[PDB]
Amino acid sequence: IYIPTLEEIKRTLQLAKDYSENVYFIYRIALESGVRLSEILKVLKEPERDICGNDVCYYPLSWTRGYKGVFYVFHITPLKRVEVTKWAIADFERRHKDAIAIKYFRKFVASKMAELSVPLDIIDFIQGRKPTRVLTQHYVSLFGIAKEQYKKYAEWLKGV
């Protein structure tokens, strides 16, 4: 399957930033977090609920598709308020065929976390996906395990 290259990500961030720094910031949080666009737009409408701790930040959210459950938007950069819909994003990509669709930023994040040996069930949780197994491998302490695993992607990302 297609996983974007780091260069393809950089070029997309740059196209965005030159179009709107707000749209850019959305792609940036997409790269930092691995979560899906809808969640990124939720957290940016209420950036105050963000929680920043030392090395990384995390924004507590709750599953809406199906039974509810707590997950976190992990990121490095403190949030700022951005008010857009998915249509702002759609317009931007329609106008830039060589900008990688934001949905593919997930694939890239997932792929990198693999190379850093983040276990797949934790990659799933970091990205705001529901468990694939009823009997999860990490019953305690899920937040801690996720955070320490995420701190490895953060370090990588910080050194580019």
UniProtKB/Swiss-Prot annotation:
Active site: R36, R106, Y139
UniProt family annotation: Belongs to the 'phage' integrase family.
Domain Tyr recombinase: 1-154
Span within the parent record: 176 to 335 of 335
Protein name, per record: Integrase
Domain of life of the organism encoding this protein: Viruses
Main function: This protein may encode a site-specific integrase, which is necessary for integration of the phage by site-specific recombination into a tRNA gene of the host chromosome. Essential for virus infection.
